[PDB]
Subunit: 230 residues, 4 copies
């Protein structure tokens, strides 16, 4: 039916997405490491829609494959997938960074999204016309700045991956979108999680024949600084 | 007030946008080369909203500038500008092309856009918060293909100008968006009404949000990769 | 024969390129609006190599078309074209710019390069294997910043036009390169001689190779990231 | 101070680079999984320069770090690093790919690159003015195509990481270049590994004040096909 899988559903924009699509009565599968926060959200949203909470680390390939294999028949076809699970770690310039932080970002922001995408593609294919993948990219995937190193690289991966995935999805009906948000809260009036939630709702309800390849959104307060000279 | 200026309002996605924003009751200035067709649309939409048809070619700096000065006072402030006037003049190999055609495209797709945006900018700035410029770019602005030459060049101009313009508009509230459509009308291509819907959504964005760019293809359209000769 | 056409040979990186290719013994066609300055450079380099100075404005399609039609037989084939004529006219905010300035920039930076390329292309094609077009782009074609508006726009045109041109030139042997310099003449900025050297290397690439784009900045120059207005 | 560390050295652009720099007499650290092929190459080049072959998988973080900390005092400063280790594992549609291959490409092309660059970065900074890092990206990092999926994402990661790195290295003198090759030999007259080696040599021998941000190079026989409509 209208079924949606959201990774990191207590992380970043995941909760706001969960709330927005619950308001619309989509069936939800919500992924989260924090079992207690996830489960409370599921319980709350359970009053307006069907929710299946899965306590799960997207880095964990085996657990993710087990979770997907064990999905109820309700989800034999999947309408939506939001790849939201991701994080930025550290402050240091690249040369004094902790490789532990770099591993975690790569495993989460890239491998996590690859696992959730590959494992769920057959169900997205099976839905067909109107199916939608929304990947959480970032302005950091395009525009370099100090300290961005791996986080930006990670988001640049996501951007190209989305475009590339569309080249493999011929005749399938499945859409793919890279949403690239700028400065969030989540007097500058930053993007709010509910703004991301509304935008993804709009993206996923696009007429079956249309694919938004990419959409870069910033607060109007945010623009580009140009170059630094040392 | 909700006021909208549209270049090439008879030409591309211009009519669809005119119709779509009339439904929402925005007051419309519509420009076009084809006077009879421009006036028939204005006459038709005048039943739903205020419309001002302006017969002009966006390439003509003096005519555009005169027309802007002569706008009625309801437009002392301007909410939206859709820079939609633009054309492609074939996909011949560059080495065989006619420089007149290349002239027409530069003057229309770049200069026409520049004139409309600069002349109207102070009115958009006067409106402030909530104001939006939508430039019509194209997928041709970033993806090379045989025969793209000048059309694609002009659309990459539009893309970069859009982003650049935002760096100049700090503190004004004015928003700038580059909309980049792919294949339009078994492909189920993009319909003009889809672009009209998309622009309405961009222009109605909450004041604090700026959609920098939005690339849209029909789902049937993807990338072919590389050619080897 | 090693024949080279250089637009704006007394502007920007143009003189440095004429000198560099002069010492390598290529025959030069050099354009410039200022006749005396152009002929002095032509006179001087005449001791090292054959030089044809043409006094013309690249915006002038008719002048440009007549000059190319009147090229001596030495130039029945063209090895190299450097599209170097171009200028900026401020970093004044867009809303307050002079449309005269903006007109001048697109006529020069865009149409000038268009007329150049189109009128000479049959001669470059007649040369065939090893022929080279080098367009002067800029970091401005890619990275947005305050007051860049039209100049960056023009340089983005140049970038896309370069790549696009390649798609029409199959079977011809002709190469096209977009060179994108940053800060030029503490900071140790790019020197005109650095550009001459890099264009020399580009035009002498083995015939089977095409450098699509090459972005060069002084090492003192990087990216500042975003600006937020409060 | 003229030392070079090359990852994936035994057969690729890798071997070509080792051989090219050996002619110039740079002192070589060569990294490779294939011990015997690696040792034979070091033995051959020991006639021309100092070589140190290190048997290693760039994916293995503990081994890379143990290898780096165990380098002779000769490499207390490091002049150049070529991050060349990387692989594609086929062109099948994403929905039918094996996640093992995706792990392998992310671990090698991203993580491997990140380990060698973080671990050696303090040695590159110690050298300072004139030091160069050359990452091997690809046309795939920028241009989508069927079956590109993870490989292209991986190369988009490399490009953005390259540019981001420059923002962290202000004041050090260290240069970072993303090189983006197209169709290679591994009647189209494709890029030969010796061409890659030639271009990296030109990059690394650049005047100290200059940074080549990126250089995309295709065989002239290669261009863009545009769009597919299903």
């Amino acid at each position: 039916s209208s079924t949606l899988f959201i990774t990191g559903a207590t992380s970043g924009f995941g909760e706001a997405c969960a709330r927005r699509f619950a308001e619309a009565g989509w069936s939800l599968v919500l992924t989260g490491r924090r079992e207690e926060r996830l489960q409370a959200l599921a319980g709350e949203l359970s009053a307006k829609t069907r929710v299946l909470p899965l306590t799960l680390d997207v880095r964990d390939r085996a657990a993710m494959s087990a979770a997907v294999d064990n999905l109820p028949e309700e989800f034999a076809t999947l309408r939506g997938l939001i790849n939201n699970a991701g994080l930025a770690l550290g402050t240091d310039p690249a040369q004094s960074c902790d490789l532990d932080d770099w591993d975690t970002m790569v495993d989460t922001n890239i491998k996590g999204l690859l696992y959730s995408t590959r494992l769920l593609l057959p169900r997205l294919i099976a839905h067909g016309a109107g199916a939608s993948i929304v990947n959480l990219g970032s302005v950091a995937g395009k525009w370099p700045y100090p300290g961005s190193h791996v986080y930006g690289g990670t988001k640049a991966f996501v951007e190209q991956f989305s475009l590339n995935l569309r080249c493999d999805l011929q005749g399938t009906g499945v859409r793919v979108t890279n949403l690239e948000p700028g400065l969030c809260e989540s007097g500058a009036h930053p993007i709010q999680p509910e703004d991301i939630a509304e935008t993804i709702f709009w993206i996923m309800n696009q007429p079956a024949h249309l694919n938004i390849n990419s959409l870069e959104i910033m607060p109007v307060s945010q623009s580009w600084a140009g170059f630094a000279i040392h």
